[PDB]
Amino acid sequence: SLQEKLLTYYRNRAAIPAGEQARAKQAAVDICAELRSFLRAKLPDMPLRDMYLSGSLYDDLQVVTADHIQLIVPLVLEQNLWSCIPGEDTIMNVPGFFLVRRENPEYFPRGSSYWDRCVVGGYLSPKTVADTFEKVVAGSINWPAIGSLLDYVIRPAPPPEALTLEVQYERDKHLFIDFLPSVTLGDTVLVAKPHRLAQYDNLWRLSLRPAETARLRALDQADSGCRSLCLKILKAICKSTPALGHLTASQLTNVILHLAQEEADWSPDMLADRFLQALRGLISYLEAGVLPSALNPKVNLFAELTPEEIDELGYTLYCSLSEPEVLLQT
């Protein structure tokens, strides 16, 4: 049955062995500690809360192999000196992105904040804040020496991933660590990440992952449902299948959250049914060219995909509907 094929696939392909996940997490802590030391010694004036490791490896959502960690760099902004503006209220008109503006510029003149060095025309530039950390990934830190010292091979990821480090942590296993400079203004948390395409690159991105995955975890906690299990299977398919790799975890997670709004029953025996509904739902969003965020409905999660990527994704999924088991090949 598709049901038993999906559970087999989960067990043998999607689930990451415990050993690699433990070893990857050590590598991340060591890198984070090396970065802590470097910033203490070289950028002591820069105000930061404690950096910490985040993402799907920390909330049991990573699949296939332990290869991706987010290192959150929480910058501290003075709450009276900075405000944020939702992109849809700016002339850029970009939902899910924000400008950050310097406030009280006369009363607290230029220099009253460290972050005044990153201001461009009165706004806190995510490009200038990212560039300050891109200098670290690209190598103001001596990663060869650190790597010899830790027994890892550490190097910058290839372009355009300028805030990402590749870390070979065991023979034959690698990890990508993304350094995410983050600011928090009231209850809004924003991240600077370089983007391919100026429209997004110029603005701070609203962090969506923690709220999306908290919704999913709450839904499953209440009924021990299979929503996460269905998500992980979809992630492992996309990770394992070259055409489908252009789908993101955030996109797949919102497909599942939209389905959880329509279907109350996610008991273990509904996995097969829900898996097929997810495929069909992805097809429908791809044909419309819009996947609204379940948490922020103005944001189109397909906005950054090109139209040919969208057409070719839709085709691959249409080809799989008659025999969905083929998506479980690796």
- Per-residue b/e over 242-272, b at no fewer than 16 CB within 10 Å? eebebbbbbbbbbbbbbbbeeeeebeeebbb
Whether residue 209 is annotated as binding a ligand: the answer is: yes
Whether residue 68 is annotated as binding a ligand: the answer is: yes
Output the CA torsion sign for 14, 15, 17, 21: positive
Distance CA 316, CA 65 (A): 24
Tokens of 261: 């709004």
Task: Mention every residue, 6+ apart, whose C-beta is less than 8 A from residue 93.
Answer: 87
Distance CA 241, CA 129 (A): 35
Cβ neighbours, 10 Å, residue 14:
21
Tokens of 214: 């908290």
Whether residue 56 is annotated as binding a ligand: the answer is: yes
Whether residue 235 is annotated as binding a ligand: the answer is: yes
Residue ranges for the binding site for ADP? Answer: 54, 56, 68, 207, 209, 235
Summarize the annotated binding site as residue ranges: 54, 56, 68, 207, 209, 235
